[PDB]
Design an enzyme around this catalytic site. Sequence first.
Site, PDB file in Angstrom:
ATOM      1  CD  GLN A 195       1.865  -9.579  -2.915  1.00 25.60           C
ATOM      2  OE1 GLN A 195       2.449 -10.058  -3.902  1.00 25.60           O
ATOM      3  NE2 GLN A 195       1.379 -10.324  -1.928  1.00 25.60           N
TER       4      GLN A 195
ATOM      5  CE  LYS B 212       5.635  -1.288  -7.795  1.00 26.22           C
ATOM      6  NZ  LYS B 212       5.382  -1.139  -9.250  1.00 26.22           N
TER       7      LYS B 212
ATOM      8  N   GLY C 239      -4.131  -3.933  -6.536  1.00 24.98           N
ATOM      9  CA  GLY C 239      -4.862  -2.776  -6.020  1.00 24.98           C
ATOM     10  C   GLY C 239      -4.152  -1.475  -6.366  1.00 24.98           C
ATOM     11  CG  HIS C 240      -0.554  -1.288  -8.259  1.00 31.77           C
ATOM     12  ND1 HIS C 240       0.505  -1.844  -8.965  1.00 31.77           N
ATOM     13  CD2 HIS C 240      -0.311  -1.553  -6.952  1.00 31.77           C
ATOM     14  CE1 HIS C 240       1.369  -2.374  -8.114  1.00 31.77           C
ATOM     15  NE2 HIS C 240       0.894  -2.218  -6.889  1.00 31.77           N
TER      16      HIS C 240
ATOM     17  CG  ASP D 233      -1.828  -1.233   1.217  1.00 30.05           C
ATOM     18  OD1 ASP D 233      -2.516  -1.499   0.186  1.00 30.05           O
ATOM     19  OD2 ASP D 233      -1.764  -1.966   2.226  1.00 30.05           O
TER      20      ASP D 233
END
Lengths: 424, 424
Positions: free
Chosen positions: B217, B17, B41-42, B14
């Site tokens: 990650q 990135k 989750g970018h 988180d």
Amino acid sequence: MGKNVVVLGTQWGDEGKGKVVDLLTERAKYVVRYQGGHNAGHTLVINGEKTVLHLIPSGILRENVISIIGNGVVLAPDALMKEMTELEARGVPVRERLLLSEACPLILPYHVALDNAREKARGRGIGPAYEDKVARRGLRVSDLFNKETFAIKLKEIVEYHNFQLVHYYKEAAVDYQKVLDDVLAIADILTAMVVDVSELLDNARKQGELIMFEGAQGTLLDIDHGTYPYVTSSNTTAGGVATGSGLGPRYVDYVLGIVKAYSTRVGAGPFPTELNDETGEFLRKQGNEYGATTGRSRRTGWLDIVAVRRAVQINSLSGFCMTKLDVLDGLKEVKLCVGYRMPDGREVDTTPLAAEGWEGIEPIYETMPGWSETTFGVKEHSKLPQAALNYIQRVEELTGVPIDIISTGPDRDETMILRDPFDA
Amino acid sequence: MGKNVVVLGTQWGDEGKGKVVDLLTERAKYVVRYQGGHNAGHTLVINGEKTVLHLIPSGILRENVISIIGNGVVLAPDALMKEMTELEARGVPVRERLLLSEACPLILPYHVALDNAREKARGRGIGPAYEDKVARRGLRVSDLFNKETFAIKLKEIVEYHNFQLVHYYKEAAVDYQKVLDDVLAIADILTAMVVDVSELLDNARKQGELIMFEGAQGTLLDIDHGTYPYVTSSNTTAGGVATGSGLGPRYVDYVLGIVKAYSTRVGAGPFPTELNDETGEFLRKQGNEYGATTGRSRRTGWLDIVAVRRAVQINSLSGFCMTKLDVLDGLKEVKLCVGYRMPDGREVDTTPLAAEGWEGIEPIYETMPGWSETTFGVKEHSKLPQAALNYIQRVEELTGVPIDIISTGPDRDETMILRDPFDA
């Protein structure tokens, strides 16, 4: 300031790496294994005396050198103890020279059980240990530092695998207590060898020391990039050095590919240049390629430049050491496979994707004169037969990679280091 | 000629990135994901419009850029199709821009079943897919090129996992035919995207093009080097780029560490600088750290320089991009953890080995003035508040790594690129 050197096999294993790591350590401060298990089979011959290593790194015979089993190596404690004890019964003070990563997974007897049951259904336990690692259900050297919680973690894992062993494979349950007892008897020996490997390696660079990294197996057995599904349970390429040791990945300075003068494979899988004829038996005999047990006689064949080009690419090779050149001595002609003819008639010079497949490839060869004057016994470059020099030159030309070291026999001294890979 | 750039999270995920990869692609020819699954989750924000990516690489919004899902990524076909279709329903011609490695493992519904059953016993299916990969019992994109043998391989694997699902986990058997049907409906879409990624990347360097590599990650979740057992199912460090893409490992030119201005962790695991107080809730609110579902509200804490130093080391970081600096706006004071006080009273500045453990660490802080003038809204370096410039400077001093990019908001334009990482 020189370059860390990574030494790895460029083909399908058995390239003769052990000898090269030992010869080149003489210079190094650290030698680090970074992947695989206790099946390296790395053979050293020093003043005619043979040593075989499976787990312990190939720098262990050199004074003032520290050998390290890095985190990428899966560790069978029984196997390590056996190698330690036997080296020690000879002159070799193993415990003075050997460090371990706490992050090494442990291979225990249930892994051997699983491995054998699986094979039946068609270095033991390496695959199942890597599998438990990915699941984060396994054990590591780090777990040995609390014996009480070690026992609790072990009980859970033994129970888990016993369900499969008993109900799926119809095999005997593994005895938790025996597994525990045998680990507890040697735990303190292993934990005494633990160091912060990442910190050591970082500091080593800053201290002006260089590191030698030792790979096992062979590039085209790489789990991702090799001849899938005929590959091993881990990465075998130079790209494993960072993750398997803690070395920062910008510090992979020189990659030395060990390339045998002809090809072998053990067991099944594609092999374009395979020789099922008298030339193949000659290579097997002269190269001592029979292996050690049933079904491990190596398939032999000509050097495959298409395949070697793949290894140059995925490893970013800096240079080669060519081994076993002497095996070719006396052949009237030698061949290099420079292309593949596909079943549809296309001629290509790159290995096929698994998507297309290797089925039905016909190798396309360059044929060159052999040499009747031997390379065996040669320790001066100018005394190599010209046809052997030409073979070497042609491999350089085809790959774009220099042959910086030439080996003409099993002994440390049967070698010509033309360019030492540690050079800035 | 410039440098390939690897972008990865330096902490426990988180770090923000997605935004950085998108801003920096503008220059690149290829953007390559090299590990993990469909849980990246970018988040990209371009002219105020949000895009979330889980699987497709974060260069996909940029013209003339080719995005590649490299072999190290485990691939859920349903997830890829959903992201493709939704990007495509917007302006984004995904199929023009996206290539796949044949060596990507497939995540299928039995992996999701296994993953959930396992979690019950205490991005779904990622771990079990990596496990099947190690065992060489899984499936890859390459298996889709023969639909007949695909079906035979699939039947075997479904049967295998159904034994465990039914008899061990007491769950429903997975329906082989439904799994097959759903794969066959989209197989040709996936196979059409396959290229020889190793060859492409090799050629790209020789062509003078540079490559951006995207990690997901976070470094201290790395399976080997992270806070074991509170780690993920794959390597997350820059050392995975070579094995996860086929890039030659000597060509890891610049490693850009994304470092959030404060710390988060999701779920359990050691967290020395954790703030279970009002400062922690402030960071959670101002940084939008609540996550998307039950149990995924991020734990928050101060920036941990001891831990970041570990990430500098194992990644060989070249430079940092500091993100979410704006979250700290208004705090009267800010803190950096520069040491750990162990339970025995020793003060150390390196992360402990799992052998010793993280239990009972007290963080040792430097306390510095905060800033009341905002960093939010800042796009000129000379307009940053001096206390924020000082915070940045102090992190550089403590780590020895420059902060080459500063991010002050979620949008692509809320950024100062002080040194572009692609530079020779």
